[PDB]
Ligand SMILES: CO[C@@H]1CN(Cc2cn(-c3ccnc(Nc4ccc5c(c4)c(C(=O)C4CC4)cn5CCF)n3)nc2C)C[C@@H]1O
């Protein structure tokens with residue numbers, strides 16, 4: 055899926071930048087119409103990571119996951135994606151404290167539907183966080199940022215690293231083991247972030263202090279205004295033992311049931 | 318008298334029995350929320366309240382800490398959660414646990430019983446099922462429903478005629494006398510259970526046959542792969558005579574020394 059640079063136009067002003075490179079809004083000429091795109095532009099291991107990121111996204115086909123248009127190799131390496139105009143969820147909620155609880159339920163349920171599909175496809179995200187959810191509209195979220203994602207081997211249900219702690223399940227920190235269950239743990243933190251309107255989890259604590267807090271059986275408190283059933287779901291996501299923690303099928307159905315009971 | 322509003326119970330049950338049910342829960346503390354295990358009486362109350370009264374007097378790293386009693390749809394005893402659950406159940410499913418690991422755990426139990434003995438409480442139900450794992454390397458004593466505070470003038474509690482007889486020292490069966498020494502006998506059975514990966518003691522024998530076997534001077538054999546020094550400690554805990562049986566001071570000391578090597 056190597057795109058033609060002649061069919062891509064990048065805007066001058068960037069949408070954002072960080073240690074990953076830059077993100078610009080762009081336009082890609084397709085069959086007949088022109089498609090608005092977001093382009094991750096690299097500013098080496100980062101090339102291979104971007105290609106691995108593109109390989110994951112091309113295997114994924116779901117309304118709640120950012121769709122890749124292709125890779126473009128010209129002047130710099132570029133990952134061209136369908137544009138989610140409103141950008142990252144945590145920034146959006148920081149700037150829009152008026153969003154209602156039923157709206158946040160809608161969004162995090164959409165994230166659980168995308169992750170239910172990711173789990174069925176036997177991919178692990180490994181970076182599930184509110185910053186990696188992007189808003190198409192105020193009522194349409196998509197999971198983004200597959201740069202750490204891994205396709206599980208056909209014979210294993212976890213990825214084993216050889217060598218963002220506040221989002222990581224205890225078995226990740228201790229055993230370097232990443233599964234769909236550890237994504238569920240990260241999903242609990244994402245939920246906490248979303249109902250906290252984009253505030254950071256475990257405020258003012260270092261990683262080792264978070265680890266020690268969880269070891270004692272302590273968990274973050276219920277965000278102000280968060281429906282009790284949603285806080286109960288977070289705590290289930292933060293089940294310490296992998297086997298008793300739910301998978302995304304159970305999480306999505308709990309969210310689906312609660313959302314329609316509100317609706 | 319805890320506020321039921323501050324407590325959430327998972328619909329799944331961890332376990333059940335004649336006492337009631339045990340459920341995982343989450344309780345709102347000062348700021349953080351605390352994972353709890355909840356013993357729920359099925360609609361016995363005064364026994365639960367007496368159990369709470371024992372636990373409220375105990376503070377030690379190797380004893381389950383009580384959060385409180387909660388009176389709502391049922392009577393509930395809310396406790397700090399030891400997530401891995403009963404030791405006998407765990408070992409059955411984890412035959413890979415090393416003998417060094419089992420030594421660390423039973424030594425932790427002897428440290429909590431040393432404290433129990435110093436506090437002059439008798440447990441009266443010391444068994445592998447009543448050791449709960451916080452982690453694979455951290456055990457806690459639980460289940461104080463039978464525990465008694467000793468009189469200021471005696472080192473034993475006298476019972477008045479539901480007893481785990483396979484864990485009871487001969488003086489418990491014959492004279493109804495429960496002391497820290499009789500907990501030491503139970504601890505010997507616990508050790509045998511731990512090194513047998515949670516097998517039940519005296520397999521296939523009735524209670525009267527266990528008593529007759531013990532009266533004959535016979536004892537359970539060495540568990541497969543159980544270290545020599547640890548089986549020897551078991552037999553010392555199973556000293557028939559109360560006065561010659563060690564106290565938890567001596568048991569803990571020997572465990573710590575063998576663990577040091
Ligand atoms: C926070 O996470 C991001 C995401 N990621 C980069 C990334 C974005 N991608 C994408 C795909 C499809 N549509 C979009 N739309 C979009 C729309 C407006 C945006 C941003 C993105 C945006 C940013 O991205 C800034 C943070 C870098 C800022 N604004 C301004 C409103 F705030 N982005 N894809 C990837 C891999 C790493 C960063 O940390």
Ligand SMILES: CO[C@@H]1CN(Cc2cn(-c3ccnc(Nc4ccc5c(c4)c(C(=O)C4CC4)cn5CCF)n3)nc2C)C[C@@H]1O
Pocket residue numbers: 331332333334339354356381396397398399400401402403406446447449459460461
């Ligand atoms: C066999 O022992 C028990 C213990 N007891 C009940 C009891 C538990 N309490 C407690 C306190 C703090 N943390 C725990 N943690 C914990 C964690 C996972 C557990 C259990 C308990 C658990 C059970 O309890 C089943 C047997 C009923 C099952 N699972 C699933 C893995 F097996 N339990 N407190 C009391 C008084 C009477 C029985 O004899």
